[PDB]
Amino acid sequence: NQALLRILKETEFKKIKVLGSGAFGTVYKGLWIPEGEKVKIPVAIKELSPKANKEILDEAYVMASVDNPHVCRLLGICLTSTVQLIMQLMPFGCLLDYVREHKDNIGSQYLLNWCVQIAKGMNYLEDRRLVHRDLAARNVLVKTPQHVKITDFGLAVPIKWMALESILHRIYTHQSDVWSYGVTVWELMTFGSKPYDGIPASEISSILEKGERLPQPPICTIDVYMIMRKCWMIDADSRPKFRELIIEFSKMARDPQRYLVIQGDERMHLPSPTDSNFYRALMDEEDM
Amino acid sequence: NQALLRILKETEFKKIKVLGSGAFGTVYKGLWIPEGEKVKIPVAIKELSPKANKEILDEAYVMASVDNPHVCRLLGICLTSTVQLIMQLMPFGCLLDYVREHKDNIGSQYLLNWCVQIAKGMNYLEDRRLVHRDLAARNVLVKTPQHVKITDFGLVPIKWMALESILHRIYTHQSDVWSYGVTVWELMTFGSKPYDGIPASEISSILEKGERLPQPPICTIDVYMIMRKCWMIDADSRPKFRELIIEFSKMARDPQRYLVIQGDERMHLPSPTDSNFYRALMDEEDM
Ligand SMILES: CN1CCC(c2ccc(-c3ccc4c(c3)C(=O)N([C@@H](C(=O)Nc3nccs3)c3cc(F)ccc3O)C4)cc2)CC1
Ligand SMILES: CN1CCC(c2ccc(-c3ccc4c(c3)C(=O)N([C@@H](C(=O)Nc3nccs3)c3cc(F)ccc3O)C4)cc2)CC1
Ligand SMILES: */C=C\C(=O)Nc1cc(Nc2nccc(-c3cn(C)c4ccccc34)n2)c(OC)cc1N(C)CCN(C)C
Ligand SMILES: */C=C\C(=O)Nc1cc(Nc2nccc(-c3cn(C)c4ccccc34)n2)c(OC)cc1N(C)CCN(C)C
C-alpha cells in the first residue's frame, strides 16, 4: 500500500525547466539522481504544515495507488515548506496542446481511440469509486501518440466543464464526470477550442438551464454528437455510463471514416505495427 | 515477423555522442525523431553491399524476434551508405564497467541475482536455439542496477571461449555455459581481466594442461564448484542453463552464506518502495 509512494529528499532531485502550472502549484521538468550512480532520470514535479501533510499524504497514497494503463500514478512526494509531488514525465505533453499543434495531421482513427482510452481510464476511476472532478483535455497526457493517460484527478473554477448539478450544488459524481467527459471529447473533435468562449462563467448555468449546449463540431457526424449531447442531459442518471461509452467509441473506432469526417483523412492513418512496436520498446513498456 | 524490425531513414535519427566500440562497429548514443513530431527519443546506434545486406537482414529479423526480460531485442536498422542498427539505450552502461565502478557498494545479493538473470536470458536463447558465442560481462547491459539484459548475441574473445571453440571453432550452447562461467568470475572479481598478462596464443595450452581461473577470495567453495563445472573439458558434462538458474537462485535466498564480502550487511537490495520507483521511471516491462 504505502510502499507505492517514495519519500524523496530535496537533495535527490532538481527542477530544471518549467512546463506550466495548474490545480495546486507549478509543474516543472526535472531529473531524478539515484543515490550512488550518475544517471539523470527525467520526471515531472508539481510544487504546491506538518498536520496538513497528513491530509496531503493520506490523499497522496490514494493517487499513488492506481494501476491502469490509462490512469497516471503518483510516484513520489517531498515534504518541504512547500510540498513537491513527482510523477513520470510524458514527453508528448498533454492532449490539449497536442491536438492544437497537429490539428492538420490528426486522422479520425487516433481521435476515436483517444476517446476510448479516456473512457477506459474514467471507467477505472469509477470502479475505484474515485471521482475525477476536473476531467478536461488539459488533464489527459500523452505517453505515446497511441497511448494517453488521465491525470490530476481526485482533488477536492472549471465551470465550462461542469455538469449543471456541480455548478448549482457542487455535486460531483461519476455521472457528473461523464458530463465533463462530454466536454473533453468536444475539445478533441474541435482541435482544442475553448468551450463557451466569451460567455461569462457566471452566466453558463443560466444558459445550460435554458437548454443551450456546445455546438456540433464540424468533423462530427450526428452519431458522435448525439453521444456528446446525452452526456449533457440535466438528469445525471440519464447520461451514459463510462462502461457504455467505451463500447460505443470502440464500435466507432472499427469504422472511423463513417463517424468523423476530416479533410485528408485517407492520407493519415495509424502507425503500422512496426511503428507501434518501435514506439513501445523505446517509450511504452507497460501492459497496454 | 518482419514487423518486429523497423526500417529507418538516416533523416529520422542522429548519432550524438560516442559511447564505445568493440564487437562489430562503433556504438553511439542517439536520438530518434518521430516523423511529424517534435519529441527527441534517446536510442543506441551501432554504425558498422546490397547483397551482403540480405545476409544482414536475415539475421536482423532473428535478433528482432526475441521476447524475454533478460535478452535485448534489436529494434531497427537503417541500411544506407553505412549499416546502422538501433536498440534501446541502457543508461547504466554495461555490467563490466558497472562492477568496476561500483565495487565499493556491490553486495552479495546483487552479484548472485545477476547470475540468476544471466542464466535466465541464456536459457531462453537456448530454447530459441540461438548460440550466443560471445557471452561476457561486457555484453551484459544494465537497464537498472536490479535488471540486466544480454546483448550482441547470434553474431576473437579467446579468454572467454570454451576449449573446443579455441581448438575447433565449435560453438554450441554448452560452449556458452563456459563463457557463462567466465562471466561469473569477472563479476565475482569485481571486474578483473581473465588470464591477465598471458598472451592469447597460449590460453589453449594452459586449458588443455588443466589449469583454470583461480577461486576469487569473496567466493565460497560452493560457488567455485559451479564455475569449475562450467569449465570441464567434456561439453556435455558442463551444467545446463536451466540448472544454473535453480542453483544461483537457491544461493540468493541466503546470500552471505555463499559470498564473503567485507561490509556486506550494510548493502542490501532496494526496498520494494525503491523497486517500484525504479520500475515506473526506467523499467516498466514484465520482469
Ligand atoms: C483544501 N484544503 C487545502 C490544503 C490541504 C491539501 C490536501 C491535499 C493535497 C493533494 C494531495 C495529493 C495530490 C494533490 C494534492 C495533487 O495535485 N495531485 C496530482 C499531482 O501531483 N500531479 C503532478 N504533476 C507533476 C508532478 S505531480 C495527481 C497526480 C497523479 F499521478 C494522480 C492523481 C493526482 O491528483 C495529487 C493538497 C493540499 C487540504 C485541504
Ligand atoms: C563477413 N561479411 C562482412 C559484413 C556483412 C554483415 C553481416 C551482419 C551484420 C549485423 C546484423 C545485425 C546486428 C549486428 C550485425 C550487430 O552487431 N547487432 C547488435 C546491435 O545492434 N548492437 C547495438 N548497440 C547500439 C545500437 S545497435 C545486436 C543488438 C540487439 F539488440 C540484439 C542482438 C544483436 O546482435 C545486430 C553486419 C554485417 C556480412 C558478411
Ligand atoms: C495541457 C497542459 C500540459 O500538461 N502541457 C505539457 C505537459 C508535459 N508533461 C507532463 N508530464 C507530467 C505532468 C504534467 C503536468 C501536470 N499539470 C497539472 C501540468 C500543468 C502544466 C504543464 C504540465 C503539467 N505534464 C509536457 O512535457 C514536455 C509539456 C507540455 N507543454 C506545455 C507542451 C510542450 N511540447 C514540448 C509538448
Ligand atoms: C561497456 C560499455 C558501454 O556499453 N557503456 C555505456 C552504454 C550505454 N548504453 C548502451 N545501450 C545499448 C547498447 C549499448 C552497448 C552494447 N555494446 C556491445 C556496446 C559497446 C560499446 C558501447 C555501447 C554498447 N550501450 C550508455 O548509455 C548512456 C552509456 C555507457 N557509458 C559511457 C558508461 C560510462 N558512464 C555511464 C559512467
Secondary structure: helix percent of chain A: 25-40%
> In CATH terms, what is the fold-level topology of the largest domain in chain A?
Transferase(Phosphotransferase), domain 1
Q: Just name the CATH architecture of the largest domain in chain A.
A: Orthogonal Bundle
Ions, cofactors and other ligands present here are:
ligand VNS, ligand YY3
Please describe the biggest sheet of chain A, giving its number of strands, its sense, and whether it closes into a barrel.
6 strands, mixed
- Going across the biggest sheet of chain A, name each strand in turn: 1-5-6-4-3-2
Give the strand content of chain A. Answer: 5-15%
User: Quick one: which chains have the greatest interface?
Assistant: A-B, 35 and 34 residues
Radius of gyration of chain A: 20 Å
Distance between the termini of chain A: 23 Å
- The structure class of chain A reads alpha+beta
Order of helices and strands of chain A: EEEEHEEHHEEHHHHHH
Helix count of chain A equals: 9
Instruction: Give the CATH superfamily of the largest domain in chain A.
Output: Transferase(Phosphotransferase) domain 1
Domains counted in the coordinates of chain A: how many?
2
Modified residues (N6-(2-hydroxyisobutyryl)lysine) (chain B): 46
Main location (chain B): membrane
Modified residues (Phosphoserine) (chain B): 271, 275
Binding site for ATP (chain B): 19-27, 46, 87-88, 152
